Amino acid sequence: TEALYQVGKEFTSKMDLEKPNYIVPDYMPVVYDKLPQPPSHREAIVNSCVFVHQTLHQANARLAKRGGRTMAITPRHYLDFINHYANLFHEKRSELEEQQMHLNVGLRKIKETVDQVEELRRKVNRSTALLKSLSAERERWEKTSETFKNQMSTIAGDCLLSAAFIAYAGYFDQQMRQNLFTTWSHHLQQANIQFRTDIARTEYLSNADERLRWQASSLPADDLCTENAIMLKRFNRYPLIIDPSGQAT
Amino acid sequence: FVNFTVTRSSLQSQCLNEVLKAERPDVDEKRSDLLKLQGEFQLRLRQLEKSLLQALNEVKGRILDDDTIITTLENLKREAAEVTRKVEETDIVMQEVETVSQQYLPLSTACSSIYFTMESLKQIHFLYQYSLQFFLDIYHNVLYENPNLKGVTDHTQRLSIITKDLFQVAFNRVARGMLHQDHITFAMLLARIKLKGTVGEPTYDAEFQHFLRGNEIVLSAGSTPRIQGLTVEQAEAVVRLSCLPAFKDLIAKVQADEQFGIWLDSSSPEQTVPYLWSEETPATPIGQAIHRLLLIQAFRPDRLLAMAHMFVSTNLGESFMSIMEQPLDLTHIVGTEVKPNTPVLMCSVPGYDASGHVEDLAAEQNTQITSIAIGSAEGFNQADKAINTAVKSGRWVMLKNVHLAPGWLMQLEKKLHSLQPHACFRLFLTMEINPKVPVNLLRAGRIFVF
Numbered sequence: 001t002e003a004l005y006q007v008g009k010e011f012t013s014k015m016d017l018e019k020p021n022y023i024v025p026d027y028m029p030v031v032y033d034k035l036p037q038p039p040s041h042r043e044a045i046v047n048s049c050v051f052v053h054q055t056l057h058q059a060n061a062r063l064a065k066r067g068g069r070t071m072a073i074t075p076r077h078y079l080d081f082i083n084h085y086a087n088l089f090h091e092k093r094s095e096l097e098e099q100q101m102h103l104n105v106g107l108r109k110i111k112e113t114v115d116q117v118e119e120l121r122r123k124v125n126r127s128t129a130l131l132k133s134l135s136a137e138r139e140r141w142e143k144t145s146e147t148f149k150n151q152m153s154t155i156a157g158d159c160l161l162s163a164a165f166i167a168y169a170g171y172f173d174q175q176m177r178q179n180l181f182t183t184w185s186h187h188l189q190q191a192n193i194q195f196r197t198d199i200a201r202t203e204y205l206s207n208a209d210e211r212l213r214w215q216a217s218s219l220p221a222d223d224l225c226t227e228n229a230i231m232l233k234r235f236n237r238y239p240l241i242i243d244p245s246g247q248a249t
Numbered sequence: 250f251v252n253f254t255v256t257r258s259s260l261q262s263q264c265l266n267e268v269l270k271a272e273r274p275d276v277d278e279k280r281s282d283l284l285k286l287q288g289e290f291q292l293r294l295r296q297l298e299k300s301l302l303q304a305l306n307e308v309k310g311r312i313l314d315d316d317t318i319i320t321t322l323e324n325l326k327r328e329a330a331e332v333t334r335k336v337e338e339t340d341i342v343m344q345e346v347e348t349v350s351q352q353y354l355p356l357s358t359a360c361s362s363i364y365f366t367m368e369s370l371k372q373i374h375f376l377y378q379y380s381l382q383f384f385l386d387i388y389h390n391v392l393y394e395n396p397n398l399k400g401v402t403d404h405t406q407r408l409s410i411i412t413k414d415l416f417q418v419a420f421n422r423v424a425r426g427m428l429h430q431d432h433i434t435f436a437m438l439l440a441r442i443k444l445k446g447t448v449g450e451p452t453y454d455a456e457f458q459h460f461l462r463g464n465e466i467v468l469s470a471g472s473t474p475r476i477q478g479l480t481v482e483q484a485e486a487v488v489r490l491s492c493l494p495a496f497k498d499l500i501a502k503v504q505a506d507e508q509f510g511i512w513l514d515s516s517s518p519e520q521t522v523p524y525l526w527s528e529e530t531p532a533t534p535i536g537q538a539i540h541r542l543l544l545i546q547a548f549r550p551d552r553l554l555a556m557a558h559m560f561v562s563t564n565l566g567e568s569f570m571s572i573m574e575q576p577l578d579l580t581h582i583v584g585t586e587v588k589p590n591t592p593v594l595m596c597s598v599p600g601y602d603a604s605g606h607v608e609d610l611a612a613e614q615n616t617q618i619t620s621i622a623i624g625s626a627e628g629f630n631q632a633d634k635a636i637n638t639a640v641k642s643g644r645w646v647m648l649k650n651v652h653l654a655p656g657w658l659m660q661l662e663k664k665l666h667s668l669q670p671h672a673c674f675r676l677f678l679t680m681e682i683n684p685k686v687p688v689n690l691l692r693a694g695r696i697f698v699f
Contacts, residue, residue, distance in 0.1 A: 071250065099295065106302050116310030126315035133322040140329050171250035175258035196287075198343070203288040222263050228251050243253035245381075 004053055004078060005031045008046040011082045015089055017042045017156055025192035030054065044191045045156060049085070051187050052164045053078050059172075059180055071171055080236050084163035088205075088234075092155050100148045107141055110134070157188045157195025162205050165227070166234055171242065174224050202226045205234065220247060255381060257361045264357040264388065265350060271392050272407060276349045279342050282335060290332055301325050355446050356412060360388065362442045363419050370423075373431055375684050376596060376698070378691035379423075387422055390586060391415045416443060416565060421572050425582075426596065426696030432573060433557050440564040444535060455493070456539050460546060464489045475500060478510040486547040495526045495540060499547075502527075512548075519545055519552040519559060538563045579610050579697070587695055589669045592661075592676040594691060597699040599681050604649050606699070607677050611645065619646045629657055636664070636676070643673035652680040655687055662690040 024038040030051040064070035121127050161184050169177045188195050214229045241248045270277045301321045308318050364384040370377035397410050424432050468488045475484045490496040502525050503509050512518050526540040538560045545556040597603045611618045619635045622628050635646045
């Protein structure tokens, strides 16, 4: 556990996972040599990662006990999980910041249009409509800014869960996948990490056009099939398909 | 590892999605709106905002004709308002979603149970090969083309009708290629599945476990003749059922009873069984029937099949097996609900012939048949030629006695995996029940037992 904690911390050091307003909860002890007694946000995230690995081992052992059919877990899986977490966090944060800067650019452009309207007044009937629509759009774009400021906070836990699902949640049926996901969610909740509540993995990890192309390319519409397709697209270790049929092929 | 394997929960989820899409399309549309709320909703909101942006830099803040930018702005306002209503209503829409899904969950659980029992039917006999596509065809038939769903629209009676029709259609589509002595076993399986499904009914797991294996417990020390009318082996059965708490006092009850002897010697005692099980609450028909079944397993095991039929009638509705008694009507089975990809595998117990059945079917439906015997090599050649020339037109090629050459049937399976140009084209394989026929062919075709 200490080795996993150290390697996770080292690999997540590059990522900006610092939240000063984060409130330290009680309990949630996983690594038994936590650096502070009250952990920080980054240390809590690394503890959640090592808990994800440990609970993958626990679920593997329980599956072996109740019917066998168990694949062993290796540190390569942990490294793949960390790489997925890093890449996915980088992608999501980059998209959010690009949308924020585009919103700011649009705000300045609309301000210039306001200047144009002000100069043109100096017909009034259309002018009143322009000003009221301007005000409405103004509060709309402001609240868009604040909701970007709220999506930014929850970009860590959601991405962690999604990456864990991409890497660890394989070869496992729907029930076990959901059990593992809810276990990780409960751990994150107990660690007081803000992740998007009841987040839907498929939409968060796939776009409309990707699902459209998948369906057009003979993919079943089942949620399991969509999750498997997402794993196929966002792969670091080359995929292995256990398909009784030939549908995946 | 990327697993595509189907499982209990996978079938549960798929069935739940199908039933939600069909029975409650508005609820499913709310599901779609919820899922796009995290995704596509803000996406096309952003795209429409960008469209307003190029509209703004196109009109250059024009005032003479303001409606060009006013229409776009009001469209953005309406879209933002709709998104706002949806996001403000996420909690209520979601909670109503789980309400509806919890309403439709027992159907999915039963569907998974039925499909996996049907798939596990391999143990009973090698001829019971069933694919997933077969069960999904059953479900597609029971959803859309259900005659009993044509009128009802209350969304609450429809669920019960769907459950009953699902069980009935599964039984009718399975037992038509299943041995007669296995009909009662499959009936008990389906009855127990629905007993698990039904609400307000105890699982009776102790009673079922007794009925299955508990009679075989070691109780040799304790065998006494009881009354002279009770034989020693029947007395031992009395002991094993006295191990069950419900029938603990059988010995005293049969000592007290003086009409028990004539019932023991009745022609069909399963019709009227004396009340022996001691229970304070009057058990529902199902519990009474299962207690009666255990009693029959104790006394007069010859009427076990009759009491099993009675139990299936009381649980799965009376005349559940009545379709099997009616002579097979293959004209409906062949004209519809069979895709031309699936060949009708004609299975007959050795010492019997079934080609006359398809011949009279063709006579009824005034259709040409290209009957070919596969014994000779020229038989194989002309069979392949007939298959090639029939898909071009739709002739019902009917091979006979094809169990002789399993390899050619492997080849035929591989060929029929390829699609057929003509829909009206039909294929029939008359063959005996041998353990050498291709399993792949059995799974890919509709098996009929004669």
